[PDB]
Each structure stands twice: as C-alpha cells, then as structure tokens.
Amino acid sequence: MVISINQVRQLYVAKALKANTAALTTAGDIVPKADTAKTTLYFQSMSPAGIVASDKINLKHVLYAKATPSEALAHKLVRYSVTLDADVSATPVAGQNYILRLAFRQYIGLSEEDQYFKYGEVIARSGMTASDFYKKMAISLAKNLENKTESTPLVNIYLISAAAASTDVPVTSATKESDLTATDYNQIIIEETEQPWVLGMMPQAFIPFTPQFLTITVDGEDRLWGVATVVTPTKTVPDGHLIADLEYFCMGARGDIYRGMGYPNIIKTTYLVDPGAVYDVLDIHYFYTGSNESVQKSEKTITLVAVDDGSHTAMNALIGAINTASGLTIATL
Amino acid sequence: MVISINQVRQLYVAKALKANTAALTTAGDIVPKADTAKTTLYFQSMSPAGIVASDKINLKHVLYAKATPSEALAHKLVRYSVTLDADVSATPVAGQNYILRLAFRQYIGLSEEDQYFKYGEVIARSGMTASDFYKKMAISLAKNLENKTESTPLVNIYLISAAAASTDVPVTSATKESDLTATDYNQIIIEETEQPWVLGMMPQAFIPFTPQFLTITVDGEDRLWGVATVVTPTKTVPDGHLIADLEYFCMGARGDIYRGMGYPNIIKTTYLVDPGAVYDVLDIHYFYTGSNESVQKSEKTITLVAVDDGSHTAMNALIGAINTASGLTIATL
Amino acid sequence: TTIRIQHKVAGNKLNKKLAMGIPMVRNLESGKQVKDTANMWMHYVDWEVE
C-alpha cells in the first residue's frame, strides 16, 4: 500500500504502556517522553532489536493531533436490493426472459475502463410467482458470481423473507430451490465482497458494481422490470489489513527500503502488526523550522496504532499519557 | 478613493444582521459563519445576485481586528477668526491699504502641493471704524473667492456681531453693505468647504488655508495688523462619501475591474453603500501561510461597514456575533 | 554517509580589505606549511571553509 506522505511518515506499534524507559522489556512497549518544561515530545519504543526513540516533536510546531477509531477504517461493503418494478408488473411475465446484468467497474486493472459484466438469466413462466422468480434469479447469479472457478470473488448474493425482513438467506452455487423453502421472498441483495490481500504486494482493494437490467416486452413495448436500490450496509472489512501494509510501508523510512530486493542478500524487518486484529490509530502532524533564514517548514507525521478491545482502552490510556506529559488535548475516542 | 492594499482588501456591507443563511433575503443581509471548533470564519452576504460568501479566515492567522466609531473618519471643517490687533492699532489707520491673503496649499481642482492665494482689499479713510472694515474686507473676499463662475466658493465668509457672538452672518458675492446694517462687527470667520465629490472619479478632499496679512505703515514702520486665530470648528464632513468610494474600489477585487471603460460594452455593478449615511467600520487582517517550502505569507483583510445611529448598535451586534462564533475578543464601540 | 557544512556572511564583506591582514599557517596539498596572509576577509573564509 504505497501512500502519499507530507515529506515523511513514521509508525510505532503501541502494544503496551510502561511509564518508564526502564520497563521497556519486550517489543511493542512504548513510552511518551516529554520534559517538565513541555517543549519536546518523543516516544521510546522497544524494537525487536533493542530500544529506539522517535523524532523529537516541538510542542510549538505541532499542527494536528487526532485519534481515529477502528470503525472509521472499516470499509462498509456496498449492497444493493434489486426487486422487480411494480409499475411495469408486480409479477413476472408469462413468457419473458429476464436477464440481469452486473457491470463491474474496476476489474483486474486499476482504471474505470477495466470493465467486466456478469449476467443472471431467468425465463419466466405462467403461474410463476415473484418469490419463485427471486429464487431462480439468485440461483442463476450464484452459478455466475459465487462459483468456485472464478478467478476472484466478485459479490455475495442473498435472499430475504418478508417474515424475517432483516435476515439475509445466503445463496451459493451449491444451493438449490429445494433448500430455499419459502414463499415470501421480497428481493435479491447483491453485496460487495472483500478482495484478497498480501503484505506489500496486494493492497486492500475492492471492485465495485452496478446492477443493470435488460428490457422485456410487457404489453407491446420494451421496458425494464427491475429497480436497483442501495440499502444500508451490514458487513465491514476490518482495519487489520490496512495497518499492516501501513507498517510494511512506514518502517522503510526508519530502516531498510530494500524490503526483499536481493533475495539472499537482504535485511529482514520483523513487524509487530497482526493483520487479524483491529487497531485504533493516532496521528500527529508537526514540522521543523530553522534559524534566521531556514524558515521553510518540514512537516512530519508520527503515527501510533493500538489494538481496540471494543472500548478503546489501549489508545485512551496512551492518549492520557501523551496529554499529561505534553499538555496536549487529543480528544479520547 | 484608490487605496494601498496589503495584497487585497474586500468590503461587505452589513445592511442587516441575520442569524442563519436561510434568513438572507434582501441585499446587504449578512451573517458571520464559523464552525464549532472555531478553525475558520467566513461571511455569507446577500448580493443583488444571490448570496456570496467571503474568503475563509483561518482564525490562527488573524493579525489584527479592530472597529471604528465613524467619528474617526469625519473631517472637521477648519475655520479661523480674523481680527485687527490692538497693538498696531485697535482701529484702521486712514490712507493705508489693508490687503488680506488666503494661502491655500492646493489649487481648486488639483491635489498637488502648491501655493495658491486669494486676496481682499480695503482702503481705510478718516471715519472708518472696525465694523465697517470687517464688512468691506468680507465683501471684497467674497467677490474675489466667490468668483467660482461654475460651482461654489473655496471658503465661506461670515461676520459675527458683538451682540450675537455666536451667529455667523453669511457673506456672498451678491451681498452688499445695505444688507449688513450692524455696527458691532468684531471678527471674520473663514470656514473650509465640502468640495465636489463623484463616486469613483473625484475623491473627497479639502484645501486648507492660512489668513496672511500684508504690511501697512502706522508710524513709519511696516507692520502686520491681523490676528488669524483658529476658533473651534462647528461643522463636520461625515464618511458616507468616503466609505462609498471604499466600496467602489474594493468591489473590483471580487467583481469587474473595468467599470465604465468600454462604455457601451461594460458590466455595471450595484453598490449598497448609501452616500448620505454614516457608517462605522470593522476590519480583520489575516494571512495565508502555506505548506512545506511555501512559508511566504499572503496577508489579507476583510472590512465590514454598518450604519451608525449615534450608538454604534449595528456594529456592536455584528462583532458580538463574531466574538460568539470565532471566539475573538474584538472590542465594542 | 552524508556530510554538510555552511557559513553565513554579511553582504558588506564583498571587498572589505583588511587593515593589517591576518598571517596564517596555511597548508598546501603536500608541500604544505606555507605561511600566508589574508588581505580580504573572504580569502580567509574561503580557506577554512574548504
């Protein structure tokens, strides 16, 4: 995850909090250090290879210091709710083929020009019901979108029973109309699915989609049967994978930039971020200005990430520490 | 009234103070707008064409912010009192020609510093007393300076009788001794005059003067007879014309800089300052610093005018709102 | 590794001839230990900067 930097960015994992430079026993222990006359601030961190300190922060040249919670970084997955238009017809047409189209916007390549379309076709029948049509439509999408041969996950598709009205019924390529025993299906949800991830090689990305419809003859005129609607998301990709790449990136400023170039002849960097966790982040923006002519600023950032137990204890304790040592006020989250 | 600028000046008229953006209905309606954290301040003003917003003021970069009472911008009209000194002679000496001079520092139509005179002749005879002298000297002055022939005198002449001592008796190029029938005239007062003003062509301006007396022979000695003392002014010149010009010039910084140049092919701007009203002014000097390597300051100022009604009510409320919004401590009038 | 140095002079030193000069033990490349004198203060600044 290559990012933009305001001339530098540096990261320190606050696994623990020790209150003294003496108590820095294990990696990830961090202490905020500021003199009584609050003019400088820095952090003594315990590295896999010994103690280490961060650049000193002039409490006069600090621009913004803010803590961001884990949920702020959790990508809510876009989910649509496609139903058939009660205007055209509240029920399927006897002998029409309903072909739903899912145009995917950012496919393998970065650009919006890298398009990819997936279809779900359902030829309706006399006596067919709406629930039965949603059933078959979702199953067709499953075979096309939730198949196992697809190179990359594309979308999740569900079903909702009016009786439930909130529970989403998964519909996978193994599912079959015998397993979907209901008659009050209202809609078809199509949700965004998390793409893969690799530290330093595949950043956390997504591929978005819009559902498009083809036109059916309802009396004698071509018309669209469906209305695609965006409803509140309910799934979120957690922060663990972003912070990890952030550390994989921001530790090359404090150290080795040749992360792996030179395979036998390299210098491995041990990391302290577990991508299976949820960290709250804290960023401080500050600068250095020189003397009598070197007034040009050098804006800099020092980021601290702490795991969230659900109530932001590690960070709130870290905030109290920095605030009582620096006189700052960083608005505990 | 072309002025000197610290890279910009912008003027907005506070014809009415409203609490919200929704209440901006008439042109001149204004509301100070600042966030709850008090990071930036801006003004939403109703122009004849929709609401316009001012520049945003980073409330950390405010250099100064003071308001004026509308009495500071008023110009008192200078007036002397001429009198013949009892030292030389408490009454005119016969045969001597008394010639009074009015030393102006500019011409009537020009602003460059020059020496410009106007004269008044009187030749004294055996019976002429002080009253008759002031009378004939005043009429001579009027006929010599009130030879305008187009517009208006350059100074105004009056006489004061010892009985009144406060009632200025006007003298014009038409006056004649038959109109002046008193015998207790004791001085001559000469006030400055409000010269022609045009909105963006002729700035408000005055031409000071000094009554100088030439030499007469009294006992074989050439001597000066007069006493040009400076009595306190009684008339004033408000800022309406002065402010209106400020608007006319400072509206070319957000509007059209040409104003009548390509006369058929122009853009005409509507101005909300009422020349004839008295405005109390407010001003906020601020700057924009910038990013890395871009420390150079772009200093700016936003000034606001509001009619005074004796008590500076309008401006006092406007600043009270601005202090409530931006937390500043601007002082009231 | 990277090394830097600086030195600020007031612009009024452009050609400030020195009154008496400043004798110095200046060293050449190898045949060094040449005693020299600074008539202009710039020559003395230039030599130690280098």
Add this chain to the structure above:
Amino acid sequence: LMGGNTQGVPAERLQQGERFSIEFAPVEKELSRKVGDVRFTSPVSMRNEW
C-alpha cells in the same frame, strides 16, 4: 524618534493638520531587511468645445 533625541517631541507638533513628508529609508550596514515603497498618481482631464 530618530536623530539622537533624548527629550521627545512636543504635542504642539503632533496635532491635527501637521503635514508630513518622506525623507528616506535608512537600514543597517549588516543584515539589512527590506524596507521602503514607491508611490503612484493618476491624471485628470479637462475639455473644451468648438
């Protein structure tokens, strides 16, 4: 107050109407910072008929 004054300037010289004039902008001989500014004026026009 410049000019080596140690006593001040009487108020009489500091009253409405006292006209002032620009003389020059002096600076240091060492490490002088920018100072001064220039001035501009506009013309007028007169007209006459045949």
